Design a protein around this nucleic acid. Structure first.
Ligand SMILES: [Mg+2]
Ligand SMILES: [Mg+2]
Ligand SMILES: [Mg+2]
Ligand SMILES: [Mg+2]
Ligand SMILES: [Mg+2]
Ligand SMILES: [Mg+2]
Ligand SMILES: [Mg+2]
Ligand SMILES: [Mg+2]
Ligand SMILES: [Mg+2]
Ligand SMILES: [Mg+2]
Ligand SMILES: [Mg+2]
Ligand SMILES: [Mg+2]
Ligand SMILES: [Mg+2]
Ligand SMILES: [Mg+2]
Ligand SMILES: [Mg+2]
Ligand SMILES: [Mg+2]
Ligand SMILES: [Mg+2]
Ligand SMILES: [Mg+2]
Ligand SMILES: [Mg+2]
Ligand SMILES: [Mg+2]
Ligand SMILES: [Mg+2]
Ligand SMILES: [Mg+2]
Ligand SMILES: [Mg+2]
Ligand SMILES: [Mg+2]
Ligand SMILES: [Mg+2]
Ligand SMILES: [Mg+2]
Ligand SMILES: [Mg+2]
Ligand SMILES: [Mg+2]
Ligand SMILES: [Mg+2]
Ligand SMILES: [Mg+2]
Ligand SMILES: [Mg+2]
Ligand SMILES: [Mg+2]
Ligand SMILES: [Mg+2]
Ligand SMILES: [Mg+2]
Ligand SMILES: [Mg+2]
Ligand SMILES: [Mg+2]
Ligand SMILES: [Mg+2]
Ligand SMILES: [Mg+2]
Ligand SMILES: [Mg+2]
Ligand SMILES: [Mg+2]
Ligand SMILES: [Mg+2]
Ligand SMILES: [Mg+2]
Ligand SMILES: [Mg+2]
Ligand SMILES: [Mg+2]
Ligand SMILES: [Mg+2]
Lengths: 75, 113, 60, 133, 253
RNA sequence: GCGGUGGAAACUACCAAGCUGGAGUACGGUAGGGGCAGAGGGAAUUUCCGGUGGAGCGGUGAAAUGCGUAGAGAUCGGAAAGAACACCAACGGCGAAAGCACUCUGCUGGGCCGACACUGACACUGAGAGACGAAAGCUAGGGGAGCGAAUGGGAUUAGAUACCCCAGUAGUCCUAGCCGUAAACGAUGGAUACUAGGCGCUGUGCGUAUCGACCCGUGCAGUGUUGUAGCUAACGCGUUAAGUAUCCC
């Protein structure tokens, strides 16, 4: 189904699992074990976005405009 | 065969006081079956093994204020498939009744050794 | 030699009471010569049964 | 695997110290060349290539044990010089020679890889990959 | 939370006026006087109107007690005030009767309350109206019941018997953080009509049992004393034989 | 050494296209005291209310304080409360570390394994910065059985502000915060590659055994004990290096 390994799909899967985890981080704030993971995964997504910005500018800007991902910290 | 579509498998054991008749027993049966089904339970399968002496004595207080000391007991066994969301009120509702002295519920995992 | 071919649960009391001592204590894995996985499941079982008064904590 | 060259060199050193004739190394232009040179110098018995799952392995036969495994007067030493952190280059007149020439020095230069001897004939300097005793 | 409505028929101006003056006009209860004019909200403490379904329209401020109060409607159109239970939100539904669900704001006799419940607004007398546990954050557990009598643990800690046929309401009384206020200044007390208090040691010997010694008085009195000559500390004033005594079991600690 | 110019194109660097073995994604499995939250359970102990009973209990190296005829301890029956979870438990499991174990359910973090299903270098480390971080301690509100700094009494002793005993306040618990330290230890930073074995265990996969439990041989992933090469000042470490090499702090 499309490319399940593609940059844009992976970044989507990460963004979605993150917004899913935000709800559990809210209901129980005292779970740090979970948050440590959230930080890891958010780190991966950030990584791929940076890589993707290096490789192709158009696909990148399209993607972070599309999935509502915040603009990058290189500015 | 059992095949849940987006539900979890469950076993529940409940224990009732030995002084009960079969009509009060089937009244509770009916009540909890209806609770399960109202909570989105396909396949409510009920089974019963009654009046076995307990390992140890158990005390239950009633709403009438009675202290009931028991020896025997009535074991009801429930195999049902429910949303993981709705198992929550069931256990409290089981603890609530004066007829259920000891209740417990288990999730069932497939055995592979 | 000895083995479990039937599903172990808290409600097979023959099964569990094989693995319980005289005084109701749970026997160690070294004695019962079971795989680790087995002994764990046994133990959880014995406890759950213990709460349902199928098997006693202490004796009479 | 930050450095492939040093890795080849290292696997050789390890197989050698353990008194084993046979080594598997991963091939590459550099690897292959280096090994070729290693053969025309006479430091290594024989080389050959293998392929599986699109991986290339050069296996290297190594010079036999010295008149037993226990009483060894000689080992065979390898040393990385220019490495990713510090790249060492030399002109024609700084080109190193090992132990008065008994060993050799490997150079990567404009005309390809070679020994210091070839560099001296042709008059070229370059990047020094390793030393070999 | 707090929004002023127009005036419902429940809010009047009629009242005692001189605070702490009795018939003779003497000041009896000291320290009152001054402070903002207030209106009386007619609370429904009895909740005696049975078996109709009430609905919380709003939540309002009351000057008279530190709790909150709720305007509730009915289908009949009658409007009452009730004490605001803790955790209740506008749109909620409440009811009183005998056979009733047990939830926040419902009112029932003590015959029907499951033991261990947390109660407020408790009649000691049938139909007299609710009396015990009416303040902010006040609550009482129903511990046990036997014979014609039910047992409570009052917010003072005191355990006491009452009648099993006396109505009471589930849920603790709202506005729990009110004592977490810090008034911060003198004026803020005076707004409440609480006037300044003079320490005994300060006044002259005629005026009070710790009277002026020369510089500053330690109380030489062999005991700390009321303005009126009674031991101030740890002398129990409960009437010895008062009728209530059979009912009262353990005393507040 | 610096500057100009003519050549060379292996290595670093750049530019264009490729490739999976590195790193990930999907799929399908499976173990687990991983974390947070909500239910339930039993011993034992202490106190309180009774019945019996009627002189000592308790305690030490030996005693005494203490508790006891106002009926102690003992024993039976009742209530109530808090805290901790016997056996299982193991030279076992998971966790980044701290830590995590009566039972259950719910929300959720990773890990590993088998398949080409896919992307195609997306990697490794990390100055500053962030988050977590035993116990004690502190702020605010609860809670308080046992234990127990402080404190008091009894002894012991030249003395005893100690060890021992009798009492016992903070605290230990819960909620919301702060503190940010420990022999926070493997006294061993992280990643990768490569170098005899023997005996073990945990999770899985394959073949065999039977057609389901073993059983065997093996592939990985982690975990433990002896030990060759090599290393080391010695002790020792030794595929989970303190060996042989590369990179970062
Ligand atoms: Mg130069
Ligand atoms: Mg008016
Ligand atoms: Mg009007
Ligand atoms: Mg007058
Ligand atoms: Mg004052
Ligand atoms: Mg004053
Ligand atoms: Mg004066
Ligand atoms: Mg006067
Ligand atoms: Mg006087
Ligand atoms: Mg005086
Ligand atoms: Mg003076
Ligand atoms: Mg020049
Ligand atoms: Mg080139
Ligand atoms: Mg490229
Ligand atoms: Mg919890
Ligand atoms: Mg008990
Ligand atoms: Mg007698
Ligand atoms: Mg005495
Ligand atoms: Mg007395
Ligand atoms: Mg007597
Ligand atoms: Mg006693
Ligand atoms: Mg309890
Ligand atoms: Mg581990
Ligand atoms: Mg623990
Ligand atoms: Mg999980
Ligand atoms: Mg491609
Ligand atoms: Mg730092
Ligand atoms: Mg912190
Ligand atoms: Mg602490
Ligand atoms: Mg202090
Ligand atoms: Mg405190
Ligand atoms: Mg205490
Ligand atoms: Mg003590
Ligand atoms: Mg002393
Ligand atoms: Mg004192
Ligand atoms: Mg002394
Ligand atoms: Mg004590
Ligand atoms: Mg805290
Ligand atoms: Mg330090
Ligand atoms: Mg530690
Ligand atoms: Mg075997
Ligand atoms: Mg391994
Ligand atoms: Mg060791
Ligand atoms: Mg060793
Ligand atoms: Mg060293």
């Amino acid at each position: 189904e499309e490319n399940k390994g593609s940059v844009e799909f992976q970044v989507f899967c990460f963004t979605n699992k993150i917004r899913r985890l935000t709800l559990h981080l809210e209901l129980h704030k005292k779970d740090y074990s979970s948050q440590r993971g959230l930080r890891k995964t958010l780190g991966k997504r950030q990584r791929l976005l940076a890589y993707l910005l290096k490789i192709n500018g158009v696909r990148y800007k399209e993607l972070i405009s599309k999935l509502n991902i915040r603009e990058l910290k290189t500015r | 065969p059992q095949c849940p579509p987006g539900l979890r498998q469950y076993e529940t054991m409940a224990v009732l006081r030995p002084d009960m008749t079969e009509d009060e027993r089937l009244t509770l049966t009916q009540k909890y079956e209806e609770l399960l089904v109202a909570g989105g339970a396909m396949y409510v399968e009920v089974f019963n093994r009654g009046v076995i002496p307990l390992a140890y004595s158990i005390k239950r207080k009633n709403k009438a204020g009675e202290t009931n000391n028991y020896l025997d007991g009535i074991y009801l066994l429930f195999t049902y498939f429910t949303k993981p969301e709705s198992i929550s009120p069931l256990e409290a509702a089981l603890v609530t009744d004066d007829d259920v002295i000891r209740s417990s519920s288990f999730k069932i995992r497939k055995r592979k050794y | 030699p000895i083995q479990s071919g039937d599903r172990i649960d808290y409600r097979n009391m023959s099964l569990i009471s094989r693995f319980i001592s005289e005084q109701g204590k749970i026997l160690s894995r070294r004695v019962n010569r079971l795989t680790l996985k087995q002994q764990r499941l046994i133990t959880s079982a014995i406890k759950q049964a213990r709460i349902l008064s199928l098997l006693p904590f202490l004796n009479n | 695997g930050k450095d492939t060259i040093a890795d080849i060199i290292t696997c050789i050193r390890n197989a050698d110290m353990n008194r084993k004739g046979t080594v598997r190394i991963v091939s590459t232009n550099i690897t292959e060349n280096i090994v070729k040179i290693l053969l025309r110098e006479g430091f290594i018995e024989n080389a050959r290539k293998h392929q599986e799952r699109n991986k290339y392995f050069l296996v290297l036969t190594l010079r036999h044990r010295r008149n037993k495994k226990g009483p060894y007067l000689n080992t065979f030493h390898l040393k990385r010089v220019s490495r990713p952190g510090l790249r060492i280059y030399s002109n024609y007149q700084r080109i190193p020679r090992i132990l008065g020439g008994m060993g050799i020095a490997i150079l990567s230069t404009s005309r390809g890889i070679m020994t210091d001897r070839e560099a001296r004939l042709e008059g070229i300097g370059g990047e020094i990959l390793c030393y070999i005793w | 939370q707090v929004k002023s409505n127009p005036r419902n028929n429940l809010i009047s101006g009629q009242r005692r006026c001189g605070k702490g003056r009795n018939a003779r006009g003497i000041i009896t209860a000291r320290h009152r006087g001054g402070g903002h004019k207030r209106l009386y909200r007619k609370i429904d403490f009895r909740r005696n109107e049975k078996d109709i379904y009430g609905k919380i329209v709003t939540i309002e401020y009351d000057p008279n007690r530190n709790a909150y109060i709720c305007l509730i409607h009915y289908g009949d159109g009658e409007k009452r005030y009730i004490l605001h239970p803790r955790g209740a939100i506008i749109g909620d539904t409440i009811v009183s009767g005998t056979e009733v669900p047990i939830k926040m704001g419902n009112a029932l006799p003590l015959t029907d309350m499951p033991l261990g419940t947390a109660i407020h607004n408790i009649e000691i007398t049938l139909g007299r109206g609710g009396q015990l546990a009416r303040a902010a954050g006040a609550v009482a557990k129903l511990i046990a019941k036997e014979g014609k009598s039910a047992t409570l643990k009052l917010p003072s800690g005191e355990v006491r018997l009452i009648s099993k046929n006396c109505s009471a309401t589930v849920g603790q009384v709202g506005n729990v953080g009110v004592n977490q206020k810090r008034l911060g200044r003198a004026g803020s007390k005076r707004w409440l009509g609480k006037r300044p208090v003079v320490r005994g040691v300060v006044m002259n010997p005629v005026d009070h049992p710790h009277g002026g010694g020369e510089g500053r008085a330690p109380i030489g009195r062999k005991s700390p004393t009321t303005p009126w000559g009674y031991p101030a500390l740890g002398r129990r004033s409960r009437k010895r034989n008062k009728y209530s005594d059979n009912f009262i079991i353990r005393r507040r600690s």
